[model samples]
Target chain A: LKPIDVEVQAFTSASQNISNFTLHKYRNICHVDTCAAHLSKSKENKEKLQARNLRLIVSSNEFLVVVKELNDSTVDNVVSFNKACAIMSAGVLKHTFDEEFDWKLSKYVKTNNTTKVIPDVKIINRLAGQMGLSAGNPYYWMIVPGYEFLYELYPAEVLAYTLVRLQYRKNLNIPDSMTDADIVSSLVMKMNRIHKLEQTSFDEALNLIGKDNVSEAYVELARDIGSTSKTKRNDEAILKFRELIASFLPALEADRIASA
Target chain B: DLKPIDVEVQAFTSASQNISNFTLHKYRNICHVDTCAAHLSKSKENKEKLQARNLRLIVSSNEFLVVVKELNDSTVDNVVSFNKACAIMSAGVLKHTFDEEFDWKLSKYVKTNNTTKVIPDVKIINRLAGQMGLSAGNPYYWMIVPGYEFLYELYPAEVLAYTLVRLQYRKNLNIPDSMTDADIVSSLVMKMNRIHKLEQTSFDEALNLIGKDNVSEAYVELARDIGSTSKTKRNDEAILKFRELIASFLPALEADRIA
Candidate 1:
């Protein structure tokens, strides 16, 4: 070890493990869902629209517009269910009404005035854009339900999680390979030399932003490295991690040496 | 004194009572562009100007445009709201009717830039709320439906206008559908202009018959009489009654021939 002998290390990642933080999540906008008709990811934001809908009845005049569920049916519901993104805004609703589907083609104008049903698909569709309808591909958001629950860890927390994932994968795959110390030491050198692009393996980048998705080891590793340069923080914690690995898991080190 | 072709007097007596009978029957209504325009007299009254009034929408069968009157341009955003009234108006109904059929698809193709972002006309939506007695002080304006919104996110305001215009133009063209591939658009504009000219000529005839005196009360009576006869969803009967009514306009046969 170095000249310091009074146990100067105080880093313990046991508090920030996956079991503790997998419930973490983040999203960028407001939306609606089956459970909550009106919802937004950022609840603190009051500027978010509470409600904006136009109601019409036969007795009074009506404008041409309708809102459709993003993934209302089929197997894709589970996929789009998570993204929680909103649907056709006021602008698109009007545009579709005037241009794509003309109310000149309206069947509701002559409806038999049946008991008020939620206007037929034909009438709701009167001003709707055909693009977002049919078996033809709906909006990607309609099917994607994209990254609502994607993890959003900051520099330090993500770094701890990345290390834990690597340790888990290391112990499971290679019993007689590099000690946990080598993993940290190798990563430090990687942080210094490898670019963020190459540092990330193909599989991890291919995965997603979710907590259960590929452990963004190198991905979050870059976040901390880039964070360091910005904040001008000392790399003292990183060195402390290497020492922690080497000191606690020396059995792997001795066993490797015996094999050699 | 005006001469009646004897049967003309009988027709007048019979037709007059029938017009009265039907006027009392408030059956299906079709407030044509001109009547809707004339209806624009009071704030609730109109007489075919859409961009000028808050509550009325002028869907001109003759003109290939849908215009809304705004109480003021700033209060509400019509195109943005795509207010239901705007939809019904653009659909060619002065009032609510599931009385006919409609197709949502473009029966006639129209060119629109589906890719660009659109800024919508705002006056119409603002007018509706005010005229409908919602937020009276707010006053709404006429907006093409979906006032400021896109058509399925594909087309903008003008694009919507284009689609509707084509629908109107095609609907107004009395030409045979078989003769379309050529200047159908040309004949359409052509037909509308001639019809418009005939309308003006009729106005002059009406004015000539009334003469230049303080005949304002007479004209109002005449307008009401014509308005009363509109209950016949079948127009041919209205034409017959109007013929008898106009014959009654002159006391003598010679006056009827000249005026």
Candidate 2:
């Protein structure tokens, strides 16, 4: 009925695919990201490390199945519920989103009370299922990474899952009819699309379409819905969706054709 | 001659939770040359030109109504109104004993891919069908295939899947790319009048005869519909033989048009 006799650890097969990412991307989990920018350098080379357990950013197209213990001390650390929110919110600072900044999520007092960083208890219950756990009590603390900590305490799928939960869920026009799982899956589908995109492909598009043209459309679309003109407000929403789909268009074309 | 409507309609299939067929359907009656020929003139020197016309027939002896409509639905107001009129006409106030207040529904068409299902259309009607005075979603639909012998009424989604499958595998099936949507819909009406000789058109064998892939889900269901009762008698002296299904209603339809 609950997360009794429960414990947290690294993902089942996360270590198998660790070589794909750089060392900077892995937090407590070492040896996963083998792409070390090596040199006979001083300790000054490494900046003051943040206290994060996992570090996988979907928008950055960096994936490592990094997962670990939830508490403060460990090489393998599951990102705290607050840190997941911070990382997702940091996507706004896309230029240097690799680190956190002052956002509304910082408004959380970082308390151990009921009004902790987790926005709603409904999130705890829903995310429990997202992690494929059957917990009768959602607020069982870090008994199974339910409250204060996310149940999906790992990288890869959990990162995308938390990204949607903490970030994209707010911006979406989700109807009440959509199941909790459905909304996450839908946005995760978009995240997957973004992940599938290659860097060279994006660079080529940017070069050919020209930075100004793409920027003009992008910045123009990314605006407040302040216009008194009702149509313009709705049109902006349409443009944003179209723009994202267009950005991912090349990937899908190459993806399906080569997929057999 | 004027604009035809492509209406998206639902089926009022009560007591059946199976929406494996009879989901959101698009229908339109476009390019009915014989019917619309009167309005569209022909240049006599060249011996040219023609006319047009859901707007249902009562299938009695079978003891249930068949609500049919032209296919591209969700077009205009008249299309919905016309289907509504056809549906409820004799449904509630039955002139005879057998009449069904039915929704003009499409049968189950498998989404070949992550389809643009227009799920809202299926969801709303099915969820609120009772309020709209209709039946539940159905697993079957009624149709008349051009070269087929029997009156079709089977898992309709499967029925649509065949036409699409054929069109998709057309190169293999020997169908030309020259065919257009108008020709496709035109063939539908033309077949309503046609009474092909009684025979079994095995969906599998037909594809095999084309020397193509013989094992698709469409093949089995296509054969299932082929074996359903034509409802029209097959014997030569069955006065109804070789008769046009639409022509019988022409007098009533033409009379009503004047009004």
Candidate 3:
């Protein structure tokens, strides 16, 4: 063997269609026919039996007219096969199967965790009123999920993301550079609006501990996730987060050590 | 301590009907009708003044009559309407009375005027109807003036206080379902009084409304330790917990009930 100088070229291409890319990936990773072949023999036999029934054509034993009718029926069967293949290849079959299985498994688990009993309408209305809503509004439940999500996650990440984005936007609009005070002021104003409190005042303990204590509390919340008691833990964490956020009055300047 | 003197006074309203009822007991008269009538009028005037003051206090505090809509289900505009109505009614009372305390402020006027403009108003109506298995098209849960007035007069202040105190005490004792209807009524009255205090009403008002007799009855109710309605899945234990927690703020109630 003799060594020779060689050059290699590299190119990059982006996929325009995600579904097509997914199909290619799946095709490469999976042996489609082999997987189908692995299905139980009884299932394959059943499929074959149904497929055989698909071949029946009426008036096959009749004369030329009947033969023409039989020929049309055969064409229809081929069309039907094409349509079925198109639908299945589009991933509808996989999704439908997965959904059905998931539903069946969920039902079988029978955890009895979901409390089916609806709350008293009076109580719900009362709670709604506390939120400054009309007692009779239809979409109250729609708005509740967002509040509940915020309450549950109270993720400092979400709050920080919101604050930072607002600050960034404000800075970009300024003809001149914003002072630390200006940036802080804008952020504080926006944060106050988003983190508005239902309670009259923030809890004294939460206020005393402040943001410095948030990291420790947040880590505890994250760790408490996924247990059987997760629902209660999440609820408590949300309430606590709300109280903390409600109490928080961010400083106009970020650098004042004592102010934060 | 010096013992207070006990004096008895009797007056005959009818010319010949009262003498036989006494059964020949000699009665010593210490007070005259003119004096009694004057005292009664003075008490009445004082009570009216106090009630007016209480009403003003409630309106000004902005603590009573919470809105009953869900947070997400309601539109911001609807919330504004409800809150504004409450505020306006409160403001009207504050402006109308020169005494500032005795204004006959009412929320009915606000609800009647502003409710229609509030969007999604009919949703709550539907929910109320549906919950009671009524036809879904009508609203039914609004506070009627007559019903509210009835609660106000029948329960009064004294009865409310006694009822709250007794209820709290009963819960504290973890009493089983062994209470009577009288006990339930007394407990509810006390609970309402406690709610009033929690909402920041004056303790003096609580005492004045409850009166000595009602307080004694409440104490008796608490001593008996009556149970209330069974907990439901929707309310679960949370509802009871909230009630007990709020009720514990009233000193008379908390004396025996607060955990």
Which has the greatest DockQ? Answer: 2
Residues B43-82, candidate 2, lDDT per residue (tens digit)?
A: 1211121112222222222222222233433334333322
Best by TM-score: 1
Q: Candidate 2 lDDT, tens digit per residue, A135-176?
A: 222211121221111211212223333333433333333355
For all predictions, the C-alpha RMSD in Å is: 37.0, 26.8, 33.1
lDDT of 3 by residue, B1-259 (tens): 1111221111111231222221001111222222322222233342355444422112222222222222322332222123222222222322221111111133111212221222122232322112223331222122111112122222343223333333344454343568743433432333333344323454444443434344444233222322333433335488778888788767876667866
Looking at model 3, give its docking quality level: incorrect
Per candidate, native contacts kept equal: 0.00, 0.00, 0.00
Q: Residues A135-196, candidate 1, lDDT per residue (tens digit)?
A: 11111112111121222222222334335435443322334576666545533433323224
TM-score of the first chain alone, every candidate = 0.17, 0.17, 0.16
TM-score: the better of candidates 1 and 3: 1
Q: Which has the higher DockQ value, candidate number 1 or candidate number 2? A: 2
Ranking by lDDT: 3, 2, 1
Estimate candidate 1's RMSD in Å: 37.0
Question: Which parts of model 2 have CA positions greater than 4 angstroms off?
Answer: A1-260, B1-53, B62-259
